Design an enzyme around this catalytic site. Structure first.
Site, PDB file in Angstrom:
ATOM      1  N   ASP A 161      22.668 105.064 -46.045  1.00  0.00           N
ATOM      2  CA  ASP A 161      23.035 105.135 -47.469  1.00  0.00           C
ATOM      3  C   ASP A 161      22.015 105.981 -48.238  1.00  0.00           C
ATOM      4  O   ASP A 161      20.843 105.605 -48.347  1.00  0.00           O
ATOM      5  CB  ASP A 161      23.128 103.734 -48.079  1.00  0.00           C
ATOM      6  CG  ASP A 161      23.559 103.712 -49.539  1.00  0.00           C
ATOM      7  OD1 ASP A 161      24.690 104.041 -49.810  1.00  0.00           O
ATOM      8  OD2 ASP A 161      22.811 103.220 -50.351  1.00  0.00           O
ATOM      9  N   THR A 206      28.224 109.636 -51.617  1.00  0.00           N
ATOM     10  CA  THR A 206      26.870 109.739 -52.194  1.00  0.00           C
ATOM     11  C   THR A 206      26.050 110.864 -51.552  1.00  0.00           C
ATOM     12  O   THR A 206      25.681 111.826 -52.224  1.00  0.00           O
ATOM     13  CB  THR A 206      26.093 108.417 -52.046  1.00  0.00           C
ATOM     14  OG1 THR A 206      26.000 108.067 -50.660  1.00  0.00           O
ATOM     15  CG2 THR A 206      26.794 107.299 -52.803  1.00  0.00           C
ATOM     16  N   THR A 207      25.977 110.821 -50.222  1.00  0.00           N
ATOM     17  CA  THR A 207      25.290 111.860 -49.430  1.00  0.00           C
ATOM     18  C   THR A 207      26.080 113.170 -49.491  1.00  0.00           C
ATOM     19  O   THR A 207      25.510 114.220 -49.772  1.00  0.00           O
ATOM     20  CB  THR A 207      25.114 111.442 -47.958  1.00  0.00           C
ATOM     21  OG1 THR A 207      24.424 110.187 -47.893  1.00  0.00           O
ATOM     22  CG2 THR A 207      24.319 112.491 -47.196  1.00  0.00           C
ATOM     23  N   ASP A 254      39.234  99.597 -37.265  1.00  0.00           N
ATOM     24  CA  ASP A 254      39.558 101.001 -37.571  1.00  0.00           C
ATOM     25  C   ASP A 254      41.003 101.364 -37.245  1.00  0.00           C
ATOM     26  O   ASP A 254      41.717 101.885 -38.094  1.00  0.00           O
ATOM     27  CB  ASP A 254      38.614 101.938 -36.813  1.00  0.00           C
ATOM     28  CG  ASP A 254      37.186 101.954 -37.341  1.00  0.00           C
ATOM     29  OD1 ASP A 254      36.966 101.457 -38.420  1.00  0.00           O
ATOM     30  OD2 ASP A 254      36.304 102.319 -36.601  1.00  0.00           O
TER      31      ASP A 254
END
Lengths: 513, 114, 114, 57
Positions: free
Chosen positions: A54, A87-88, A380
């Site tokens: 994160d 975010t990244t 997933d």
């Protein structure tokens, strides 16, 4: 005017400093970006250790000094509040986008043009995504098996990818009802080390990690009639304070027999319903267990309140408050209720339900860590099957979108002409970072892969390309069922561009010392 | 082993520092490069004024501190001794060429190949 | 970016330092390992005396300064919580295993392979 | 060991020479060795997984 000690940068100096600080941070986090992104280990001055991917966490924990670097930290926090993910991505993409944009500024292209060109190309990018998206039957059996199996492949569980893909598609299809919204809450994941992955299975019912409370209870019940009560089966007392005032010896017996009748009537009524299984939320007195056992009724006590509700949904039993209100219409059906040992531990199986709206996938494996990863693999598979059921659109990955967009935007650029074409051209060139870091993080030749893929894509088509990091060569993405939802890519672009536009809007930076 | 006060950078740190220092110098002189290149006015601590386009002169006169920047100064002088012209060209081109080359290194392309 | 006073090592420097610190600790405790392993006598600044073979105890009591050495201390504690025994074994074996593994890294064998 | 076999070897620290381990009843449980390897490897894997070390002053 300003207190001695205050420092100020303006114009091109303010711009140079701000960009450079942002870029260096981007280089620090970019190594985490993508499926092949790695993690960092941060050890504070106290000894505490944090290992994460994160962007916010990394930046929140680190102790920055530079004011310009502190101002960028606010970007990361706003990204989290607004969108959550990206975010990244937003920081890294925003940095390169700003760098490439400044190359235009140096060429004397008004920043209002650069920002407009990006906006325009970004909005057009979403249209192109909707256009190239390959529409499929939401509930197509065959294609669903590819989604499932594609996920499972390359994991420890691949040994039984065929069976697993089958159970996974079926589980979702059952609980989804209509076409369609899915609630993953109706698909339970129970994992117990023991056996192998081959033993994994789907159970059209529920697997509870409890035991039959009393030994004397039947070990097998057929065509069971299950009762779900939430009121305790005890001697009720009035809310108002009360007490018996005995005045004759005849009463010492009168009341004892009265309480016995009340207790027997309670139990007798349950049996009278034809119920052979009973789930009570509160407690069950020992004597009640004894009678329940003698009547061959199976009972469970001290059930969680939240579990009582999950049990109602799954089994299709109606929770009743007063026994007086219970009727046959409130009874639920289970094809089988049986005590099984799994890895020695006793568990209850509610299987062979008519048309269950909640299913369980019992996972087996040679290790705890193995069944944990198998659980992630399914989480997933259910996810992606869900994405396709709600949005009957799929698209090739391996940076195929960005390549399509780069091509079409270049032509559109020529149509618009002027300086604005340079802005749209830079957006198209900026899209290449995705292909660049996909192969970089994979350890593939970024230059050579891109040249081979793009060429092959131009020849074989759209559903006969992409990068296959696993084999390190072009493939058929469609044949291999390597697809992602359009929504992933569309939202990524949207949130990404809105952050870039905020930075592009700034033409003045005033940072205190 | 080394006298306290000595500073050392190695591996990717030595490479990052050296490239970056060279690049910044290149950005400073590149504005003179070409038929449409402009000139600089350098006024020392004494008052003397030099207005030139020559890369060597600009770099010779300026007072550099960083060791990595001092090592690049030798490049400019050797360029003058060997060829005469191409001082600014060689520095600017050499910088970009090194930057683009490092992008290949990050991709894991052996520098002997590049 | 970072407060003056903070120190950082990265890449092969971070690796060299971490391995070396771990190895030296391993050499200190390895003399206790095995049926023929011997014991240590640790006398604190207060006069209290502890004579043990336990890796955790020895490392818990001693007063380490180096951050890299402090990070390895966490390994010993987690080993105790998880398995109980093998504290000395795991540290000693882990050290040699890491040393031999780095010889492969120098040969350019991707750590994912090792 | 390669010559005499599996039950005709080992080290005998007491006599400082090869012996017959089986004849001398010098045996240990498999569980000792198996658990030792298991726990040992899981710790090594944790260290091997680290590719970044950031230690404050």
């Amino acid at each position: 005017v300003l207190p001695e000690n205050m420092k100020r940068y303006m114009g091109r100096d303010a711009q140079r400093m701000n960009i450079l600080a942002g870029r260096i941070i981007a280089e620090t986090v970019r190594s985490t970006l993508g499926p092949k992104g790695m993690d960092k280990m941060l050890v504070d001055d106290l000894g505490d250790v944090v290992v994460t991917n994160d962007g916010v966490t990394i930046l929140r924990e680190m102790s920055v000094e530079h004011p310009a670097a502190k101002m960028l930290i606010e970007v990361a926090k706003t990204q989290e509040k607004e969108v959550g993910d990206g975010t990244t991505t937003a920081v890294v993409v925003a940095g390169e986008l700003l760098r490439k944009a400044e190359e235009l500024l140096d060429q004397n292209v008004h920043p209002t043009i650069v920002v407009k060109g990006y906006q325009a190309a970004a909005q057009k990018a979403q249209e192109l995504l909707k256009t190239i998206a390959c529409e499929v039957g939401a509930q197509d059996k065959e294609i669903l098996t590819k989604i499932a199996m594609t996920s499972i492949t390359g994991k420890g569980a691949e040994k039984a990818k065929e069976k697993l893909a089958e159970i996974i598609v079926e589980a979702v299809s059952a609980v989804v009802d209509d076409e369609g919204k899915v609630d993953k809450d109706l698909i339970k994941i129970e994992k117990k080390s023991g056996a192998s992955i081959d033993d994994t299975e789907l159970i059209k019912g529920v697997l509870v990690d409890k035991e039959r409370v009393s030994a004397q209870m039947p070990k097998k019940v057929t065509d069971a009639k299950i009762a779900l009560l939430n009121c305790a089966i005890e001697i009720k007392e009035t809310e108002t304070d009360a007490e018996i005032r005995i005045t004759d010896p005849a009463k010492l017996m009168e009341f004892i027999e009265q309480e016995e009748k009340m207790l027997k009537d309670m139990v007798a009524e349950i049996k009278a319903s034809g119920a052979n299984v009973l789930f009570c939320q509160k407690g069950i007195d020992d004597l009640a267990q004894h009678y329940l056992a003698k009547e061959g009724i199976v009972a469970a006590r001290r059930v969680k309140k939240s579990d009582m509700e999950k049990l109602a949904k799954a089994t299709g039993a109606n929770v009743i408050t007063n026994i007086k209100d219970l009727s046959a219409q409130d009874l639920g059906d289970a094809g089988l209720v049986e005590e099984r040992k799994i890895s020695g531990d006793s568990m209850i199986f509610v299987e062979e339900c008519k048309h269950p709206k909640a299913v369980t996938m019992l996972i087996r494996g040679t290790t705890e860590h193995v069944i944990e990863e198998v659980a992630r693999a399914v989480d997933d598979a259910v996810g992606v099957v869900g994405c396709t059921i709600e949005d009957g659109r799929i698209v090739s990955g391996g940076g195929s979108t960005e390549v399509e967009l780069s091509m079409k935007l270049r032509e559109y650029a020529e149509g618009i002409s002027g300086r604005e074409q340079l802005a749209v051209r830079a957006f198209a060139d900026a899209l290449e970072v995705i292909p660049r870091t996909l192969a970089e993080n994979a350890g593939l030749d970024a230059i050579e892969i891109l040249v081979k893929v793009r060429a092959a894509h131009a020849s074989n088509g759209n559903k006969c390309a992409g990068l296959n990091v696993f084999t390190g060569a072009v493939e058929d993405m469609c044949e291999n069922g390597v697809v992602e939802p359009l929504r992933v890519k569309t939202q990524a672009i949207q949130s990404a561009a809105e952050s870039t536009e905020m930075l592009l809007r700034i033409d003045d930076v005033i940072a205190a010392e």
